[PDB]
């Protein structure tokens, strides 16, 4: 493994248009190379267009559509915006790499899915240990800066389906080379 191979990405968020801060994450390409590559290519959007979706493979413009207090925030659905869409750069969904990293710490980044090998683009950031997710969800990165923006988003008022009343937008994203 090489810590040198670990890349960095960011998510500039806005809540109802107001600047909320930047989230900087460290991806672990030395432990989840396939997964992390998906994430970074999605932040920079340099992977083109969805083979199935058709829409651009880019988190930019997508939202954080679901949030749970004392738990996590979820987003990355850039094709439906409701949690039923999203697509990886590899065309459609891709497989679960070795579940090496766990949700034994707060603020780790993980892949949201709908069962085995169903990784699309949707991901979540926890704000608490979520061991009941270990081995079921692939943990690829970790927040190293701006964990307060996550906390700010997590406690936003939501509707009955846990969607934030305000529009939480990833106004911009990319890599920190």
């Amino acid at each position: 493994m090489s810590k040198k191979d670990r890349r960095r990405v960011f998510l500039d968020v806005t809540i109802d248009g107001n600047l909320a801060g930047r989230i900087v994450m460290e991806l672990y390409n030395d432990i989840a190379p396939r997964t992390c590559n998906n994430f970074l290519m999605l932040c920079t959007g340099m992977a083109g267009t969805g083979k199935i979706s058709g829409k651009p493979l880019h988190y930019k413009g997508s939202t954080f559509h679901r949030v749970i207090k004392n738990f996590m925030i979820q987003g990355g659905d850039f094709t439906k915006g409701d949690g039923t869409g999203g697509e990886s750069i590899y065309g459609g969904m891709f497989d679960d790499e070795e579940f090496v990293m766990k949700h034994d710490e707060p603020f780790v980044v993980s892949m949201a899915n709908k069962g085995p090998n169903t990784n699309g683009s949707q991901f979540f950031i926890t704000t608490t240990p979520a061991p009941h997710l270990n081995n079921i969800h692939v943990v690829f990165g970790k927040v190293v800066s701006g964990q307060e923006v996550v906390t700010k988003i997590e406690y936003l008022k939501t509707n009955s389906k846990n969607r934030p009343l305000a529009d939480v937008v990833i106004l911009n994203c990319g890599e920190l080379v």
Partner: peptide
């Protein structure tokens, strides 16, 4: 409850 899925959301 506390799950993070894409499509079939549970409690």
């Amino acid at each position: 409850x506390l799950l993070v899925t894409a499509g079939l959301v549970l409690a």
